[PDB]
């Protein structure tokens, strides 16, 4: 998701969400201190890389340990 979809779509969605929170009663009493923005281009590349790499490692580690354990242990 972070490597295929890119920033401007998510920024426009977050703009709609900012409008929704500012216009919703009983929730506009609560205000953010930092403005919500989409992740930057490099940050999103890094985050997609991190989720991708963690999935790679955990998938293969589970497969290799459980397969060797099931066949031999």
Partner 1 sequence: SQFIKPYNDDPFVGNLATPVSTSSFTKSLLSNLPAYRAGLSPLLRGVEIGLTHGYFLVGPFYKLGPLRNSDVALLSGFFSALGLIIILVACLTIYGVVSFEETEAKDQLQTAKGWRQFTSGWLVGSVGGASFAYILISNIPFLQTAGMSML
Using CB under 8 A as the criterion, which residues of the chain lie in contact with partner 1 when the complex forms?
19, 22-23, 25-26, 29-31, 33
CB of 36 to partner 1, least distance (A): 16
**Whose Cβ is closer to partner 1: residue 1's or residue 26's?**
26
Between 9 and 19, whose beta carbon lies closer to partner 1?
A: 19
Shortest Å, Cβ 23 to partner 1: 6
CA distances to 8, 9, 64, 69 from 39, rounded to whole Å, are 10, 11, 35, 41
Q: Is the Cβ–Cβ distance between 10 and 38 less than 8 Å?
A: yes
8 Å CB contact between 39 and 7: yes
């Amino acid at each position: 998701m972070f490597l295929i979809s890119w920033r401007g779509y998510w920024q426009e969605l977050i703009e709609t969400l900012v409008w929704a929170h500012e216009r919703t009663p009983l929730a506009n009493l609560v205000r953010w201190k930092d403005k919500p923005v989409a992740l930057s281009i490099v940050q999103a590349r890094l985050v997609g890389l991190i989720h991708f790499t963690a999935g790679y490692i955990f998938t293969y580690a589970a497969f290799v340990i459980a397969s060797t354990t099931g066949k031999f242990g």
